Design a protein around this motif. Structure first.
Motif, PDB file in Angstrom:
ATOM      1  N   UNK A 154       0.788  -1.218   0.000  1.00 60.10           N
ATOM      2  CA  UNK A 154       0.000   0.000   0.000  1.00 60.10           C
ATOM      3  C   UNK A 154       0.826   1.278   0.000  1.00 60.10           C
ATOM      4  N   UNK A 155       0.147   2.399  -0.177  1.00 58.82           N
ATOM      5  CA  UNK A 155       0.736   3.700   0.120  1.00 58.82           C
ATOM      6  C   UNK A 155       0.037   4.288   1.346  1.00 58.82           C
ATOM      7  N   UNK A 195      -3.980   0.811  -1.694  1.00 60.67           N
ATOM      8  CA  UNK A 195      -3.254  -0.096  -2.604  1.00 60.67           C
ATOM      9  C   UNK A 195      -2.434   0.672  -3.645  1.00 60.67           C
ATOM     10  N   UNK A 196      -1.130   0.408  -3.681  1.00 56.11           N
ATOM     11  CA  UNK A 196      -0.172   1.244  -4.403  1.00 56.11           C
ATOM     12  C   UNK A 196      -0.309   1.183  -5.919  1.00 56.11           C
ATOM     13  N   UNK A 225     -14.468   3.046   4.112  1.00 53.21           N
ATOM     14  CA  UNK A 225     -13.534   2.020   3.666  1.00 53.21           C
ATOM     15  C   UNK A 225     -13.023   2.299   2.260  1.00 53.21           C
ATOM     16  N   UNK A 226     -13.165   3.550   1.847  1.00 50.34           N
ATOM     17  CA  UNK A 226     -12.965   3.955   0.468  1.00 50.34           C
ATOM     18  C   UNK A 226     -12.112   5.207   0.334  1.00 50.34           C
ATOM     19  N   UNK A 239     -10.995   0.679  -2.775  1.00 43.93           N
ATOM     20  CA  UNK A 239     -11.038   0.121  -1.438  1.00 43.93           C
ATOM     21  C   UNK A 239      -9.707   0.364  -0.700  1.00 43.93           C
ATOM     22  N   UNK A 240      -9.775   0.714   0.581  1.00 41.88           N
ATOM     23  CA  UNK A 240      -8.567   0.903   1.381  1.00 41.88           C
ATOM     24  C   UNK A 240      -7.978  -0.454   1.759  1.00 41.88           C
TER      25      UNK A 240
END
Ligand code: NA
Lengths: 379, 10, 382, 10
Positions: A154-155, A195-196, A225-226, A239-240
């Protein structure tokens, strides 16, 4: 009611191309590879959604009849990319969608929408950032993300009022970019993990002098969650990522025993020459002393290479080695004429930042930093 | 190849 | 014997190595990926040989010390493509080859030559031919060659030689391509044919020559093909490729003497249209309905999508609908190098002739004499 | 998909 519209070839193709970037390839649920076309009052809306990532763009079009239709994504993008520069006439009739343009006539089957998920509502707006800054910063930090280890893919996005911090690591490098933005609602103190690959792909795309980031506001930052991303006529969601980012700030050295400043272009072109002989691209060596940097790579059995560069260097001389790709990855993300390296020992992280006695030397304050772990010299 | 000194993770 | 030492211009050296490298194997015997450097009186010679294909190129250089050395072809080629625009100093010292250029210093290990085979001699020169047309002709017919070593005699390009011309042919059983070229023999009358791996000959063509003509070396008289080699000689360059030992199909019987229908059309328009319509083709055909003045292209199915497009065509004779593999069709259209194509048809299930168009009655129409022809088998309509 | 009428080969 049956969708029927006329649209310019160029605007249709570019919009479908924008959406098609975010469609899944060979999805377990085949209808998820569809593109949704909806004619409204404003004009034409083009969307894709696969439950995880959504993309929606509005384009002007002459709507002869309102309606919506779902059609195969890759086929639509391939057709629209291949049409002449003429007007495009799209018309839904029964279970087919007719697309005519000049002498060319296509007749595609409609996809069923019963198992096609609806676009999610974007969260409340959190803040606004210039588009060029957004692309650059995401592009900088994403280079350090893992491709798996979910917490590395992820970032991290930390928000403290006006300030934003982006970070990513794969355990070998760590990239951190700090920037300022304009808050939309009230003061916010929060952090999410995005998500990267997804965020990086969204940034590379067009977006529009501004990018609006929607994460919610108040005590509900991160609640939906977004992450929503909005630009002129475009809206997208991701989505996170559900994982805890590692604590990274302790990693950044307060001071160095040696610092070196050199041109990024000079150094990169030279790194590419020397690394030619590196078996499996193992390692490149950097020997610093006086006013010269000696690069070398390779081994006796495979071939050796070396090159001397002029360099501004201070402190205790040292030889340190790196993964050549990790190194050029760092160098290429600086977007400066020169780089300053900050070292301690051959086996401890090296700092690269965009660019004085015997030392030690205080760490420089910069908006961007790329922390690179060395590899060991052969012994 | 050492890693960055993440604890935990290295 | 002495250590090779020279200085060379980077552009000259890089071009020559690149040229050799295209013909190296990417191998069961590692040393065969080696490149041999030889410093002589005239200058520098660069070569590779792997028992099947050889390539030798001579370039100007200041030879400080005569000798030869074998080095990794892959490594040499990568290094030379990355050197700055500066003189290149090459020096052999013990088991390594030093290479310096500007501030850059490389050291390649030398390769053992005891199992490195010697370049073969070229056969006697058989004729001269224009280098550009020869390259063009090979690339034309190579598109029709089989690629599957299951069947050797389809993987080759047949080279028929006569006192007046060279004929090149290739087929994969679905298309046949035949190109005729003028050449001038060294000995006058000859009548012979050999078979050359299509892949290696096509590679030799793309690699390119610096002059305007090349000499083909196949021998002379009864001794043509006796050496089992085809040699190609140009200015500063020579290459050899081992002949295929298989019998080429009897192909001239496939070429129709006449046509019940004929159509002429611009290649770019038809090609762009085929690529559009075939977007809906699963895996596998495109349909061509020929009428007076119009050709309707169509493809697809009710389950995936259908597509159709109309083009003006100059058409004559008995109307028909005929279908092709779209890729075999655009392969042929792209091999034509002319502005317009003429189709020669008989029936929907018999081969169609594609020819460069030149400058329409009732029929039947006698076949046209052209230097090039691409013969394409249809697929059956559903 | 017929072949070309190579005899033999097809
Ligand atoms: Na040689």
């Amino acid at each position: 009611t049956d969708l029927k519209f006329r649209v310019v070839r160029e605007d249709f193709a570019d919009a479908v191309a924008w959406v098609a970037r975010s469609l899944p390839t060979r999805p377990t649920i085949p209808v998820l590879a569809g593109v949704l076309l909806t004619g409204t009052d404003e004009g034409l809306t083009i969307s894709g959604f696969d439950y995880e990532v959504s993309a929606e763009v509005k384009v002007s079009a002459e709507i002869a009849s309102a309606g919506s239709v779902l059609v195969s994504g890759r086929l639509l993008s391939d057709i629209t990319k291949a049409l002449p520069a003429k007007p495009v006439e799209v018309s839904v009739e029964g279970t087919r969608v007719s697309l005519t343009c000049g002498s060319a006539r296509f007749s595609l089957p409609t996809l069923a929408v019963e198992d096609y998920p609806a676009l999610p509502a974007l969260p409340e707006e959190t803040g606004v950032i210039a588009s060029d800054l957004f692309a650059e910063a995401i592009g900088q930090v994403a280079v350090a993300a893992g491709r798996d280890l979910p917490m590395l893919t992820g970032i991290r996005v930390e928000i403290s009022g006006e300030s934003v911090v982006l970070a990513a690591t794969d355990r070998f490098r760590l990239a951190v970019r700090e920037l300022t933005w304009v808050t939309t609602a009230g003061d916010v103190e929060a952090a999410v993990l995005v998500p990267a690959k997804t965020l990086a792909e969204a940034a590379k795309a067009g977006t529009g002098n501004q990018v609006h980031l929607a994460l919610g506001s108040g005590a509900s930052v991160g609640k939906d969650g977004l992450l929503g991303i909005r630009s002129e006529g475009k809206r997208s969601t991701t989505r996170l990522l559900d994982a805890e980012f590692p604590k990274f700030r302790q990693l950044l050295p307060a001071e160095h025993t040696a610092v070196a400043t050199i041109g990024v272009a000079e150094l990169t072109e030279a790194i590419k020459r020397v690394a030619l002989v590196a078996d499996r691209g193992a390692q490149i060596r950097m020997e610093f002393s006086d006013d010269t940097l000696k690069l070398s790579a390779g081994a006796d059995d495979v071939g050796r290479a070396e090159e001397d560069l002029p360099v501004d260097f201070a402190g205790e001389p040292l030889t340190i080695a790196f993964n050549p790709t990790y190194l050029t990855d760092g160098l290429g993300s600086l977007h400066s004429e020169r780089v300053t390296f900050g070292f301690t020992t051959p086996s401890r992280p090296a700092v690269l930042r965009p660019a004085g006695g015997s030392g030690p030397f205080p760490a420089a304050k910069t908006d961007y930093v790329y922390l690179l772990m060395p590899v060991r010299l052969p012994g | 190849v050492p890693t960055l000194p993440l604890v935990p993770x290295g």
